[PDB]
Amino acid sequence: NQNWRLLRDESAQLRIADVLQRKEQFRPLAKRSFIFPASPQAVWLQVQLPAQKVPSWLWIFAPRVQYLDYYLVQDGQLVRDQHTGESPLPSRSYLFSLPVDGKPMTLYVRMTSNHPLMAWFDQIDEAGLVGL
Amino acid sequence: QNWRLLRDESAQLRIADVLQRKEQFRPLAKRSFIFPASPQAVWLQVQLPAQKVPSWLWIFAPRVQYLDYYLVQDGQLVRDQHTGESRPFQERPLPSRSYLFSLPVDGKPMTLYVRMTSNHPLMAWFDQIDEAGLVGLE
Amino acid sequence: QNWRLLRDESAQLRIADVLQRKEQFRPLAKRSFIFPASPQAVWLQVQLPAQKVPSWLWIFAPRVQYLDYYLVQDGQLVRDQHTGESRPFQERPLPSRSYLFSLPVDGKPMTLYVRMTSNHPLMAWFDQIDEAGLVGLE
Amino acid sequence: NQNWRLLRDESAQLRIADVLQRKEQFRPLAKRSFIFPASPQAVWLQVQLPAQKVPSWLWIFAPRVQYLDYYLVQDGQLVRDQHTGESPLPSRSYLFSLPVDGKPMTLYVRMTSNHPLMAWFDQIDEAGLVGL
Protein backbone atom coordinates (compact mmCIF):
# COMPACT_ATOMS: atom_id res chain seq x y z
CA ASN A 1 0.00 0.00 0.00
CA GLN A 2 2.44 2.74 -1.17
CA ASN A 3 2.96 5.60 -3.66
CA TRP A 4 6.66 4.68 -3.80
CA ARG A 5 7.90 2.67 -6.80
CA LEU A 6 11.37 1.89 -8.16
CA LEU A 7 13.06 1.23 -11.49
CA ARG A 8 16.63 -0.08 -11.92
CA ASP A 9 18.14 1.00 -15.22
CA GLU A 10 21.21 -1.21 -15.37
CA SER A 11 22.20 0.51 -18.61
CA ALA A 12 22.03 4.03 -17.14
CA GLN A 13 20.83 5.44 -20.50
CA LEU A 14 17.21 6.29 -19.57
CA ARG A 15 16.52 10.03 -19.57
CA ILE A 16 13.46 11.66 -17.95
CA ALA A 17 11.66 11.61 -21.36
CA ASP A 18 12.35 7.86 -21.70
CA VAL A 19 11.26 7.14 -18.12
CA LEU A 20 7.86 8.85 -18.63
CA GLN A 21 7.16 6.19 -21.31
CA ARG A 22 8.07 3.44 -18.85
CA LYS A 23 5.75 3.83 -15.86
CA GLU A 24 4.60 0.16 -15.74
CA GLN A 25 8.20 -0.90 -15.20
CA PHE A 26 8.44 0.84 -11.82
CA ARG A 27 7.95 -1.82 -9.19
CA PRO A 28 6.51 -1.25 -5.72
CA LEU A 29 8.55 -0.69 -2.56
CA ALA A 30 8.03 -2.69 0.61
CA LYS A 31 9.85 0.05 2.46
CA ARG A 32 11.06 3.58 1.82
CA SER A 33 14.76 2.81 1.39
CA PHE A 34 17.01 0.62 -0.79
CA ILE A 35 20.59 -0.61 -0.99
CA PHE A 36 22.50 -2.02 -3.99
CA PRO A 37 26.07 -3.23 -4.60
CA ALA A 38 28.33 -0.49 -5.99
CA SER A 39 27.75 -0.36 -9.78
CA PRO A 40 27.08 1.97 -12.71
CA GLN A 41 23.26 1.43 -12.75
CA ALA A 42 20.88 4.36 -12.45
CA VAL A 43 18.19 3.92 -9.90
CA TRP A 44 14.92 5.78 -10.34
CA LEU A 45 12.47 6.46 -7.67
CA GLN A 46 8.95 7.43 -8.64
CA VAL A 47 6.65 9.09 -6.13
CA GLN A 48 3.00 9.53 -6.99
CA LEU A 49 1.27 12.14 -4.89
CA PRO A 50 -2.20 13.66 -4.73
CA ALA A 51 -2.81 17.41 -4.56
CA GLN A 52 -1.27 18.75 -1.36
CA LYS A 53 -3.18 20.61 1.36
CA VAL A 54 -0.21 21.82 3.36
CA PRO A 55 3.51 22.67 2.90
CA SER A 56 5.55 19.43 2.48
CA TRP A 57 8.99 18.24 1.41
CA LEU A 58 10.45 15.19 -0.16
CA TRP A 59 13.37 14.16 2.07
CA ILE A 60 16.09 11.87 0.79
CA PHE A 61 19.13 10.78 2.66
CA ALA A 62 21.66 9.33 0.21
CA PRO A 63 25.28 9.29 1.30
CA ARG A 64 27.92 9.17 -1.42
CA VAL A 65 25.41 9.58 -4.22
CA GLN A 66 27.47 11.23 -6.93
CA TYR A 67 24.58 12.38 -9.16
CA LEU A 68 21.11 12.97 -7.90
CA ASP A 69 18.55 14.22 -10.42
CA TYR A 70 15.18 15.47 -9.31
CA TYR A 71 12.16 16.05 -11.49
CA LEU A 72 8.69 17.16 -10.75
CA VAL A 73 6.00 16.33 -13.33
CA GLN A 74 2.60 17.93 -13.82
CA ASP A 75 0.59 16.88 -15.81
CA GLY A 76 2.81 15.12 -18.31
CA GLN A 77 5.12 18.08 -18.37
CA LEU A 78 8.28 18.82 -16.50
CA VAL A 79 7.92 21.78 -14.16
CA ARG A 80 11.04 21.65 -12.02
CA ASP A 81 14.35 20.00 -12.55
CA GLN A 82 17.34 20.09 -10.20
CA HIS A 83 20.69 18.42 -10.55
CA THR A 84 22.74 17.90 -7.46
CA GLY A 85 24.61 15.13 -5.56
CA GLU A 86 28.09 14.99 -3.99
CA SER A 87 29.26 15.54 -7.61
CA PRO A 88 33.49 20.80 0.25
CA LEU A 89 29.82 19.94 1.08
CA PRO A 90 29.22 18.34 4.53
CA SER A 91 25.54 17.30 4.04
CA ARG A 92 24.06 14.12 2.67
CA SER A 93 20.38 15.10 2.89
CA TYR A 94 18.22 16.56 0.21
CA LEU A 95 14.92 18.35 0.66
CA PHE A 96 12.66 19.33 -2.17
CA SER A 97 9.68 21.52 -1.33
CA LEU A 98 6.36 20.40 -2.76
CA PRO A 99 3.90 22.85 -4.33
CA VAL A 100 0.42 23.37 -2.93
CA ASP A 101 -1.55 24.13 -6.10
CA GLY A 102 -4.58 21.80 -6.10
CA LYS A 103 -2.86 19.37 -8.51
CA PRO A 104 -1.39 15.87 -8.32
CA MET A 105 2.26 15.54 -9.15
CA THR A 106 4.82 12.87 -9.91
CA LEU A 107 8.37 13.01 -8.53
CA TYR A 108 11.24 11.24 -10.16
CA VAL A 109 14.68 10.88 -8.66
CA ARG A 110 17.61 9.46 -10.48
CA MET A 111 20.56 8.24 -8.50
CA THR A 112 23.94 7.19 -9.60
CA SER A 113 27.10 6.31 -7.72
CA ASN A 114 30.55 4.77 -7.63
CA HIS A 115 29.79 3.48 -4.11
CA PRO A 116 27.03 1.17 -2.87
CA LEU A 117 23.87 2.98 -3.78
CA MET A 118 21.61 3.49 -0.82
CA ALA A 119 18.94 5.92 0.17
CA TRP A 120 16.12 6.49 2.60
CA PHE A 121 13.27 8.80 1.67
CA ASP A 122 10.01 10.10 3.19
CA GLN A 123 7.39 12.74 2.64
CA ILE A 124 7.40 15.17 5.56
CA ASP A 125 5.28 18.13 6.46
CA GLU A 126 5.38 20.63 9.33
CA ALA A 127 3.86 18.11 11.77
CA GLY A 128 6.28 15.38 10.69
CA LEU A 129 5.84 12.20 8.60
CA VAL A 130 2.92 12.63 6.22
CA GLY A 131 0.38 10.20 7.65
CA LEU A 132 1.27 10.83 11.37
CA GLN B 1 10.58 57.20 -3.65
CA ASN B 2 11.11 54.36 -4.40
CA TRP B 3 9.10 52.13 -2.11
CA ARG B 4 5.52 53.10 -2.74
CA LEU B 5 1.96 52.42 -1.60
CA LEU B 6 -1.65 52.51 -2.82
CA ARG B 7 -4.84 51.86 -0.80
CA ASP B 8 -7.75 50.08 -2.56
CA GLU B 9 -10.79 50.50 -0.32
CA SER B 10 -12.88 48.40 -2.70
CA ALA B 11 -10.52 45.39 -2.23
CA GLN B 12 -11.32 44.57 -5.85
CA LEU B 13 -8.41 45.84 -7.98
CA ARG B 14 -6.19 43.25 -9.58
CA ILE B 15 -2.64 43.21 -10.92
CA ALA B 16 -3.72 44.25 -14.42
CA ASP B 17 -5.45 47.39 -13.02
CA VAL B 18 -2.59 48.37 -10.72
CA LEU B 19 -0.14 48.49 -13.64
CA GLN B 20 -2.33 51.11 -15.35
CA ARG B 21 -2.40 53.13 -12.11
CA LYS B 22 1.40 53.21 -11.63
CA GLU B 23 1.38 56.86 -10.62
CA GLN B 24 -1.37 56.77 -8.00
CA PHE B 25 1.13 55.10 -5.62
CA ARG B 26 2.39 57.32 -2.81
CA PRO B 27 6.04 57.08 -1.59
CA LEU B 28 6.61 55.61 1.91
CA ALA B 29 8.43 57.49 4.62
CA LYS B 30 9.61 54.23 6.15
CA ARG B 31 9.42 50.59 5.17
CA SER B 32 6.43 49.60 7.26
CA PHE B 33 2.73 50.44 7.77
CA ILE B 34 -0.15 49.87 10.15
CA PHE B 35 -3.85 50.57 9.50
CA PRO B 36 -6.90 49.82 11.73
CA ALA B 37 -9.00 46.71 10.81
CA SER B 38 -10.80 47.43 7.51
CA PRO B 39 -11.71 45.37 4.45
CA GLN B 40 -9.34 47.49 2.28
CA ALA B 41 -6.50 46.07 0.16
CA VAL B 42 -3.05 47.64 0.42
CA TRP B 43 -0.64 47.43 -2.53
CA LEU B 44 3.11 47.84 -2.23
CA GLN B 45 5.24 48.78 -5.23
CA VAL B 46 9.03 48.53 -5.24
CA GLN B 47 11.20 49.75 -8.10
CA LEU B 48 14.64 48.18 -8.26
CA PRO B 49 17.65 48.61 -10.58
CA ALA B 50 19.57 45.64 -12.01
CA GLN B 51 21.02 43.42 -9.25
CA LYS B 52 24.66 42.30 -8.80
CA VAL B 53 24.19 40.00 -5.82
CA PRO B 54 21.65 37.61 -4.36
CA SER B 55 18.99 39.43 -2.38
CA TRP B 56 15.45 39.01 -1.19
CA LEU B 57 12.46 41.03 -0.55
CA TRP B 58 11.66 40.25 3.04
CA ILE B 59 8.14 40.95 4.21
CA PHE B 60 6.96 40.42 7.77
CA ALA B 61 3.19 40.53 7.58
CA PRO B 62 1.73 39.11 10.77
CA ARG B 63 -2.09 38.64 10.60
CA VAL B 64 -2.20 39.40 6.87
CA GLN B 65 -4.72 36.86 5.53
CA TYR B 66 -3.96 37.07 1.81
CA LEU B 67 -0.62 38.14 0.53
CA ASP B 68 0.06 38.25 -3.20
CA TYR B 69 3.38 38.89 -4.79
CA TYR B 70 4.25 39.73 -8.41
CA LEU B 71 7.52 40.49 -10.09
CA VAL B 72 7.32 42.65 -13.19
CA GLN B 73 9.85 43.26 -15.95
CA ASP B 74 9.38 45.23 -19.20
CA GLY B 75 5.68 45.47 -18.27
CA GLN B 76 5.52 41.66 -18.10
CA LEU B 77 4.49 39.43 -15.21
CA VAL B 78 7.57 37.21 -14.63
CA ARG B 79 6.77 35.57 -11.27
CA ASP B 80 3.86 35.44 -8.85
CA GLN B 81 3.20 33.79 -5.51
CA HIS B 82 0.12 33.66 -3.38
CA THR B 83 0.28 33.09 0.30
CA GLY B 84 -0.85 34.85 3.52
CA GLU B 85 -2.06 33.37 6.79
CA SER B 86 -5.32 32.03 5.31
CA ARG B 87 -3.39 30.05 2.73
CA PRO B 88 -0.45 27.58 2.86
CA PHE B 89 2.84 29.22 3.73
CA GLN B 90 5.31 29.71 0.83
CA GLU B 91 7.64 26.90 -0.29
CA ARG B 92 10.90 27.01 1.66
CA PRO B 93 14.05 25.01 1.21
CA LEU B 94 13.66 23.89 4.86
CA PRO B 95 10.74 23.84 7.26
CA SER B 96 10.38 27.30 8.64
CA ARG B 97 10.28 26.06 12.24
CA SER B 98 13.47 24.04 11.92
CA TYR B 99 16.10 24.95 14.53
CA LEU B 100 19.40 26.34 13.32
CA PHE B 101 22.67 26.48 15.28
CA SER B 102 25.68 28.39 14.11
CA LEU B 103 28.88 26.39 14.12
CA PRO B 104 31.97 28.48 14.90
CA VAL B 105 34.83 28.86 12.45
CA ASP B 106 37.65 28.89 15.04
CA GLY B 107 40.37 26.34 14.15
CA LYS B 108 39.13 23.92 16.82
CA PRO B 109 37.20 20.60 16.71
CA MET B 110 33.72 20.50 18.35
CA THR B 111 31.15 18.13 19.66
CA LEU B 112 27.45 18.85 19.85
CA TYR B 113 24.69 17.49 21.98
CA VAL B 114 20.95 17.69 21.65
CA ARG B 115 18.40 16.26 24.06
CA MET B 116 14.94 15.72 22.80
CA THR B 117 11.78 14.59 24.53
CA SER B 118 8.13 14.44 23.55
CA ASN B 119 4.82 12.91 24.55
CA HIS B 120 3.94 12.38 20.86
CA PRO B 121 6.13 10.00 18.79
CA LEU B 122 9.78 11.16 18.73
CA MET B 123 10.96 12.30 15.33
CA ALA B 124 13.80 14.43 13.99
CA TRP B 125 15.63 14.99 10.66
CA PHE B 126 18.94 16.83 10.80
CA ASP B 127 22.19 17.61 9.05
CA GLN B 128 25.01 20.15 8.77
CA ILE B 129 24.32 22.65 6.03
CA ASP B 130 26.06 25.64 4.50
CA GLU B 131 24.87 29.09 3.18
CA ALA B 132 23.54 27.61 -0.11
CA GLY B 133 21.47 24.82 1.52
CA LEU B 134 19.98 27.38 3.88
CA VAL B 135 18.91 29.66 1.10
CA GLY B 136 18.12 27.25 -1.72
CA LEU B 137 19.59 27.78 -5.21
CA GLU B 138 17.96 30.98 -6.67
CA GLN C 1 30.27 7.25 12.91
CA ASN C 2 30.20 10.19 13.42
CA TRP C 3 26.62 11.19 14.07
CA ARG C 4 25.61 9.22 17.12
CA LEU C 5 22.68 8.47 19.40
CA LEU C 6 21.84 7.41 22.96
CA ARG C 7 18.39 6.59 24.43
CA ASP C 8 17.71 7.59 28.08
CA GLU C 9 14.53 5.79 29.12
CA SER C 10 14.66 7.47 32.54
CA ALA C 11 14.49 10.96 30.91
CA GLN C 12 16.69 12.09 33.79
CA LEU C 13 20.28 12.24 32.50
CA ARG C 14 21.83 15.66 32.12
CA ILE C 15 24.68 17.11 30.08
CA ALA C 16 27.26 16.39 32.80
CA ASP C 17 26.31 12.67 32.81
CA VAL C 18 26.26 12.30 29.03
CA LEU C 19 29.86 13.52 28.76
CA GLN C 20 30.98 10.66 31.04
CA ARG C 21 29.04 8.20 28.85
CA LYS C 22 30.62 9.30 25.54
CA GLU C 23 31.02 5.74 24.33
CA GLN C 24 27.50 4.45 25.01
CA PHE C 25 26.34 6.41 21.93
CA ARG C 26 25.48 4.28 18.91
CA PRO C 27 26.29 5.50 15.34
CA LEU C 28 23.31 6.43 13.11
CA ALA C 29 22.70 4.83 9.76
CA LYS C 30 21.01 7.97 8.50
CA ARG C 31 20.48 11.45 9.85
CA SER C 32 16.97 11.01 11.19
CA PHE C 33 14.96 8.93 13.68
CA ILE C 34 11.42 8.08 14.69
CA PHE C 35 10.28 6.32 17.89
CA PRO C 36 6.71 5.62 19.15
CA ALA C 37 5.34 7.96 21.89
CA SER C 38 7.29 7.27 25.11
CA PRO C 39 8.57 9.42 27.97
CA GLN C 40 12.21 8.61 26.98
CA ALA C 41 14.86 11.25 26.21
CA VAL C 42 16.93 10.89 23.04
CA TRP C 43 20.43 12.39 22.88
CA LEU C 44 22.24 13.20 19.66
CA GLN C 45 26.02 13.56 19.55
CA VAL C 46 27.87 15.05 16.58
CA GLN C 47 31.66 15.14 16.31
CA LEU C 48 33.01 17.76 13.94
CA PRO C 49 36.52 18.77 12.83
CA ALA C 50 37.66 22.41 12.65
CA GLN C 51 35.47 24.47 10.29
CA LYS C 52 36.59 26.63 7.32
CA VAL C 53 33.22 28.09 6.37
CA PRO C 54 29.97 29.21 7.95
CA SER C 55 27.66 26.29 8.59
CA TRP C 56 24.77 25.30 10.79
CA LEU C 57 23.40 22.32 12.44
CA TRP C 58 19.89 22.15 11.11
CA ILE C 59 17.40 20.14 13.11
CA PHE C 60 13.79 19.62 12.07
CA ALA C 61 12.06 18.30 15.16
CA PRO C 62 8.32 18.58 14.71
CA ARG C 63 6.35 17.77 17.93
CA VAL C 64 9.51 17.68 20.05
CA GLN C 65 8.45 19.44 23.28
CA TYR C 66 11.87 20.14 24.80
CA LEU C 67 14.93 20.48 22.71
CA ASP C 68 18.28 21.25 24.31
CA TYR C 69 21.45 22.04 22.49
CA TYR C 70 25.04 22.18 23.76
CA LEU C 71 28.29 22.85 22.01
CA VAL C 72 31.37 21.33 23.59
CA GLN C 73 35.05 22.08 23.08
CA ASP C 74 38.05 20.67 25.00
CA GLY C 75 35.50 19.06 27.36
CA GLN C 76 34.02 22.51 28.04
CA LEU C 77 30.46 23.72 27.58
CA VAL C 78 30.84 26.70 25.18
CA ARG C 79 27.22 27.38 24.15
CA ASP C 80 23.77 26.11 25.07
CA GLN C 81 20.23 26.83 23.94
CA HIS C 82 16.93 25.56 25.17
CA THR C 83 13.90 25.51 23.00
CA GLY C 84 11.35 22.93 21.72
CA GLU C 85 7.65 23.33 21.04
CA SER C 86 6.72 23.75 24.72
CA ARG C 87 9.09 26.68 25.04
CA PRO C 88 9.67 29.92 23.05
CA PHE C 89 11.20 29.34 19.65
CA GLN C 90 14.92 30.21 19.30
CA GLU C 91 16.06 33.78 18.58
CA ARG C 92 16.21 34.42 14.83
CA PRO C 93 17.51 37.40 12.95
CA LEU C 94 14.04 37.67 11.33
CA PRO C 95 10.62 36.33 12.26
CA SER C 96 10.50 32.76 11.13
CA ARG C 97 7.17 33.25 9.34
CA SER C 98 8.39 36.23 7.35
CA TYR C 99 7.95 35.81 3.58
CA LEU C 100 11.05 35.83 1.41
CA PHE C 101 11.21 36.44 -2.35
CA SER C 102 14.29 35.87 -4.38
CA LEU C 103 15.26 38.78 -6.58
CA PRO C 104 16.90 37.73 -9.86
CA VAL C 105 20.43 38.76 -10.77
CA ASP C 106 19.82 39.21 -14.52
CA GLY C 107 21.06 42.63 -15.72
CA LYS C 108 17.51 44.00 -15.87
CA PRO C 109 15.51 46.45 -13.69
CA MET C 110 12.41 45.11 -11.86
CA THR C 111 9.27 46.23 -10.17
CA LEU C 112 7.48 44.30 -7.47
CA TYR C 113 3.93 44.27 -6.28
CA VAL C 114 2.36 42.91 -3.15
CA ARG C 115 -1.33 42.96 -2.27
CA MET C 116 -2.27 42.54 1.30
CA THR C 117 -5.62 42.24 3.00
CA SER C 118 -6.76 41.33 6.50
CA ASN C 119 -9.74 41.49 8.82
CA HIS C 120 -7.43 42.33 11.75
CA PRO C 121 -5.46 45.62 11.63
CA LEU C 122 -3.18 45.77 8.56
CA MET C 123 0.51 45.70 9.41
CA ALA C 124 3.72 44.89 7.55
CA TRP C 125 7.49 45.56 7.95
CA PHE C 126 9.67 44.93 4.91
CA ASP C 127 12.97 45.59 3.21
CA GLN C 128 15.47 44.22 0.69
CA ILE C 129 18.12 42.15 2.40
CA ASP C 130 21.22 40.22 1.38
CA GLU C 131 22.80 36.85 2.49
CA ALA C 132 24.25 38.36 5.72
CA GLY C 133 20.97 39.98 6.90
CA LEU C 134 19.19 36.71 6.27
CA VAL C 135 21.61 34.72 8.34
CA GLY C 136 22.65 37.18 11.03
CA LEU C 137 26.35 37.79 11.79
CA GLU C 138 27.74 34.53 13.38
CA ASN D 1 3.03 56.14 29.18
CA GLN D 2 6.11 54.61 27.44
CA ASN D 3 9.30 52.57 27.97
CA TRP D 4 10.99 54.68 25.28
CA ARG D 5 13.34 57.48 26.39
CA LEU D 6 15.92 59.58 24.56
CA LEU D 7 19.22 61.33 25.27
CA ARG D 8 20.94 63.81 22.91
CA ASP D 9 24.68 63.89 23.45
CA GLU D 10 25.63 66.98 21.47
CA SER D 11 29.28 66.27 22.27
CA ALA D 12 29.20 62.70 20.94
CA GLN D 13 31.72 61.58 23.61
CA LEU D 14 29.42 59.43 25.79
CA ARG D 15 30.30 55.73 25.69
CA ILE D 16 28.01 52.92 26.89
CA ALA D 17 29.78 52.97 30.31
CA ASP D 18 29.16 56.74 30.62
CA VAL D 19 25.52 56.42 29.53
CA LEU D 20 24.76 53.79 32.22
CA GLN D 21 25.66 56.49 34.80
CA ARG D 22 23.25 58.91 33.13
CA LYS D 23 19.82 57.27 33.16
CA GLU D 24 17.93 60.27 34.65
CA GLN D 25 18.98 62.34 31.66
CA PHE D 26 17.00 60.23 29.20
CA ARG D 27 13.78 62.07 28.53
CA PRO D 28 10.47 60.46 27.55
CA LEU D 29 9.19 60.06 23.99
CA ALA D 30 5.74 61.19 22.91
CA LYS D 31 6.11 58.93 19.91
CA ARG D 32 8.40 56.17 18.71
CA SER D 33 10.37 58.19 16.15
CA PHE D 34 12.52 61.34 16.01
CA ILE D 35 14.09 63.70 13.50
CA PHE D 36 16.98 66.17 13.97
CA PRO D 37 18.88 68.59 11.71
CA ALA D 38 22.04 67.03 10.24
CA SER D 39 24.80 67.38 12.88
CA PRO D 40 27.56 65.51 14.71
CA GLN D 41 25.47 64.75 17.86
CA ALA D 42 25.00 61.19 19.07
CA VAL D 43 21.45 60.27 19.80
CA TRP D 44 20.76 57.53 22.33
CA LEU D 45 17.61 55.62 22.61
CA GLN D 46 16.91 53.73 25.80
CA VAL D 47 14.29 50.99 25.87
CA GLN D 48 13.26 49.52 29.19
CA LEU D 49 11.59 46.16 28.89
CA PRO D 50 10.20 43.58 31.30
CA ALA D 51 11.00 39.87 31.02
CA GLN D 52 9.67 38.58 27.71
CA LYS D 53 7.16 35.74 27.31
CA VAL D 54 7.48 35.25 23.58
CA PRO D 55 10.02 35.78 20.74
CA SER D 56 10.33 39.53 19.94
CA TRP D 57 12.53 41.97 18.03
CA LEU D 58 13.51 45.55 18.32
CA TRP D 59 12.89 47.08 14.88
CA ILE D 60 14.53 50.33 13.86
CA PHE D 61 14.22 52.02 10.55
CA ALA D 62 16.98 54.63 10.22
CA PRO D 63 17.94 55.68 6.72
CA ARG D 64 21.41 57.15 6.22
CA VAL D 65 22.49 56.42 9.77
CA GLN D 66 26.24 56.05 9.43
CA TYR D 67 26.92 54.41 12.82
CA LEU D 68 24.35 52.49 14.74
CA ASP D 69 25.46 50.93 18.02
CA TYR D 70 23.28 48.45 19.83
CA TYR D 71 23.67 47.29 23.39
CA LEU D 72 21.69 44.98 25.53
CA VAL D 73 22.08 45.31 29.32
CA GLN D 74 21.28 42.79 32.02
CA ASP D 75 21.48 43.44 34.96
CA GLY D 76 24.02 46.25 34.96
CA GLN D 77 26.23 44.29 32.64
CA LEU D 78 26.59 44.31 28.91
CA VAL D 79 25.53 41.05 27.32
CA ARG D 80 25.37 41.83 23.62
CA ASP D 81 26.93 44.54 21.59
CA GLN D 82 26.62 45.04 17.82
CA HIS D 83 28.05 47.76 15.66
CA THR D 84 26.46 48.38 12.32
CA GLY D 85 24.99 51.24 10.22
CA GLU D 86 25.46 52.25 6.56
CA SER D 87 29.12 52.76 7.65
CA PRO D 88 26.77 47.92 -1.21
CA LEU D 89 23.96 47.35 1.38
CA PRO D 90 20.38 48.03 0.13
CA SER D 91 18.56 47.86 3.52
CA ARG D 92 17.83 50.56 6.04
CA SER D 93 16.11 48.40 8.67
CA TYR D 94 17.62 46.79 11.69
CA LEU D 95 16.18 43.95 13.73
CA PHE D 96 17.60 42.79 17.01
CA SER D 97 16.14 39.63 18.51
CA LEU D 98 15.22 39.82 22.17
CA PRO D 99 16.03 37.00 24.61
CA VAL D 100 13.32 35.13 26.47
CA ASP D 101 15.08 34.32 29.75
CA GLY D 102 12.77 35.48 32.56
CA LYS D 103 14.75 38.72 33.02
CA PRO D 104 14.19 42.41 32.35
CA MET D 105 16.60 44.08 29.99
CA THR D 106 17.61 47.54 28.87
CA LEU D 107 18.38 48.34 25.21
CA TYR D 108 20.55 51.22 24.19
CA VAL D 109 20.98 52.43 20.65
CA ARG D 110 23.46 55.04 19.63
CA MET D 111 22.98 56.80 16.35
CA THR D 112 25.22 59.09 14.49
CA SER D 113 25.05 60.62 11.04
CA ASN D 114 26.21 63.18 8.51
CA HIS D 115 22.61 63.50 7.29
CA PRO D 116 19.45 64.52 9.16
CA LEU D 117 19.17 61.95 11.89
CA MET D 118 15.84 60.22 11.88
CA ALA D 119 14.50 56.91 13.00
CA TRP D 120 11.32 55.01 13.72
CA PHE D 121 11.38 52.09 16.13
CA ASP D 122 8.94 49.53 17.60
CA GLN D 123 8.91 46.31 19.55
CA ILE D 124 7.41 43.56 17.42
CA ASP D 125 6.59 39.96 18.06
CA GLU D 126 5.19 37.17 15.87
CA ALA D 127 1.65 38.58 16.11
CA GLY D 128 2.83 42.10 15.28
CA LEU D 129 3.22 45.27 17.40
CA VAL D 130 3.76 44.31 21.03
CA GLY D 131 0.52 45.48 22.65
CA LEU D 132 -1.77 44.53 19.66
TrEMBL record, chains A, D:
- The domain of life is Bacteria
**Source organism (scientific name):** Pseudomonas aeruginosa (strain ATCC 15692 / DSM 22644 / CIP 104116 / JCM 14847 / LMG 12228 / 1C / PRS 101 / PAO1)
Q: What is this protein called?
A: histidine kinase
